A paper describes a structure:
The structure provided superb electron density for amino acids 265–342 of [name]. The domain assembles into a concave four-stranded antiparallel β-sheet, complemented on one side by two α-helices. The β1 strand forms the central part of the fold with the adjacent β3 arranged in an antiparallel manner, and β4 and β2 contacting β1 and β3, respectively. As in other [name] domains, the [name]-[name] domain is assembled by two repeats. In addition to the hydrogen-bonding network between the β-strands, hydrophobic interactions play an essential role in linking the two repeats in a single compact structure. (i) There is no discernable conformational change in the backbone of the [name] domain upon ligand binding (rmsd of 0.27 Å for Cα superimposition of [name] domain alone and in complex with 1). Therefore, our results do not support the existence of “open” and “closed” conformations as a general mechanism in [name] domain recognition, as previously proposed. Changes only concern side chains of residues R302 and R309, which offer two distinct conformations with direct involvement in ligand recognition and F274 that slightly changes its orientation upon ligand binding.
Of all [name]-domain-containing proteins, [name] is the most highly conserved across bacterial species, which underscores its important physiological role in bacteria. It is predicted to have two domains, a catalytic “double-ψ β-barrel” domain (DPBB; Pfam 03330) and a C-terminal [name] domain. In the present report, we disclose the X-ray structure of the [name] domain of rare lipoprotein A ([name]) from [name] ([name]-[name]).
Author numbering: 266 to 341
Amino acid sequence: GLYLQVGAFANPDAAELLKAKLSGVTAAPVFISSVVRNQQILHRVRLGPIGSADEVSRTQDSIRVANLGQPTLVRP
């Protein structure tokens, strides 16, 4: 499956907020993957697995319509 990342935040409330908003625009699973980067925690907001490239493109479109960020492909 294919995955998108929509934002990455130092503040977990901001990541959780984006996750909640994304649930209103896609049916794909939305999740936070938190990692240590540059001596801090980075909370990455991701969605997937998406079953096709065409669904990825339409999901990117929906995220932009909702003004929720710049969705980019990622490989966990």
